[PDB]
Symmetry: C4
Amino acid sequence: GRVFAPYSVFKGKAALSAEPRLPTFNRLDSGGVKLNRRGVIMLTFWPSVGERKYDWEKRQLFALSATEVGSLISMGTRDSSEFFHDPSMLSSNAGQVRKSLSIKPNADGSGYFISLSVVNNNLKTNDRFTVPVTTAEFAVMRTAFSFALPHIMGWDRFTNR
Amino acid sequence: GRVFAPYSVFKGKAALSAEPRLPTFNRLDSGGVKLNRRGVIMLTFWPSVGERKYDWEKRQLFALSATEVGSLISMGTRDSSEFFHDPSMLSSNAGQVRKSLSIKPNADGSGYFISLSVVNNNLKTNDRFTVPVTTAEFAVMRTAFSFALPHIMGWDRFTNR
Amino acid sequence: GRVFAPYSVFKGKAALSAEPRLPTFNRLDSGGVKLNRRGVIMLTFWPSVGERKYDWEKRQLFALSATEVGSLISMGTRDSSEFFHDPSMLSSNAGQVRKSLSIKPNADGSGYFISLSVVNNNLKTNDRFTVPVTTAEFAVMRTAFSFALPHIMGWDRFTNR
Amino acid sequence: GRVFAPYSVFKGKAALSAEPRLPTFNRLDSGGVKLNRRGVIMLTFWPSVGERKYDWEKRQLFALSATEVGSLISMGTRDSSEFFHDPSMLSSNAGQVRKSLSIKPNADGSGYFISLSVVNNNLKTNDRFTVPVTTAEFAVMRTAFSFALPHIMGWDRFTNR
DNA sequence: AAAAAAAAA
DNA sequence: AAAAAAAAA
DNA sequence: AAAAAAAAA
DNA sequence: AAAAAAAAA
């Protein structure tokens, strides 16, 4: 069944959570197994209400694909990347919701700012959660993501006994 | 049985697929186990027919050995490597078919071009599939290959319980 | 049950031991599993009495969290980090005991000094164990810690079969 | 039982083989498990007799400890390391046999020379096998050794389920 | 709740 | 066949 | 369908 | 014996 062991970062204005969603497989009728829906690294952002307390119900999600992960783990100190996602893509509700994840170095080079933006043209809202991430914390993600990458790709199945 | 979870890259003129083929073992009569045929990282190239559609039947293969993998994961941004293979080697049909895989950085340093060339003197054909690969994508291969390397070498068997 | 395979470094004035403490989980009533208490990399320091012999009973501990680990594995040759811990935190006995772990490069760049300081205002004691660590040894920790990081985070549970 | 999957390099004058020997454990009477004898990365050198053929019976061994491994995987392009071993150490036959492993970059920086020297004062012999190693091959060892390091340390036992 | 799609045993 | 030793549940 | 070979318990 | 806490299925 499910497993809940997210790496989390709690800061002044918002919280960040990251955990792997494994790929789904389909047992073929040839006997073997085929990778079906792809795994990701899910990112959850949510706001801090009141004093050191976080409103879990106003949360927004961002699914990192294998390639977006590779883009992140290969980031240099002075590098920055930005990903743009439409949840309801190739679907009926396209163009309506627009997510954009940005990773930028801060002035000091003492880390990055990781912010999620969500623009919903249906509900007429504009949300933005930003979380500062230190070098040590981003080292955690880098390493944890690297480790997780083969698994979300399904490559952990290629095992000798 | 078999497992199908290839990392794939689909571009304008062709598609690239990479997946590990595990080594085969032979149970000795001493009780232990001996590595027999070696594992590789198989690369499959195939052409794009019509509009965003790929002719799976005109595909060519290239098997990366452990050492060729190590050559790839240790490539710098400005580096390039070229591998040359004869499928029917030390065999009757040698010199007939000639494969050459090249990995070159593009001008921008924004990635590499990965091309497969196949020259068949029997069928009198000359094929060449090239796929551009971004930094993020090549980061995926680098990481996925690194992870896979111990497995195709059989070293995943050396495990404490 | 428990497992005892610490990486150890024995030097002139003191000994250093490092081993992973895995996270604890709670099986939810939803069926799945939830990470409970977090894993760490435990560091044990203890003094050398007499000639090449070490007083196991005067030992002090320091628990590295995931983020402190990431801080360590991302250290450059010329880098240094210092962690400050209060064992009895958010508790009744706070402010009483104070631990500080320092990792500093030595002049030669031939490694680091890893020292633990413990100031106990209850028992009125002031302890300090320092252990020199070569590049090769610190390479061992770096690698061993990197490997261990996903496990103490609970991410080794995200596995395809 | 035993497992035989060595990474091997065959060159003009000699052959090199590398494979992990796992640590031995002792089940305590407390229930848990304790690491006993330490694992290593065994290196086997042997001479080439005649034309492309190798005299398996004149082979010499060198056991890499965890720390020696860390020294090797942290080697730069222009770096070189030398290890010195006495097989019959803290024993009756000490000082008699003397092994020295050297890893040096070649002029081109196109790899290293890995040579084993064995001086036996009992049998009055002086042996020396050298094997050139390319960047790609040394990348294989680096990666394969890194992967193996946690295992020979016993850290592969710290696993969540 | 999650950006999807292209080959195929 | 292998460089070993130091604490300890 | 795949570049192979060299030692050996 | 260990620096803890914040959401939640």
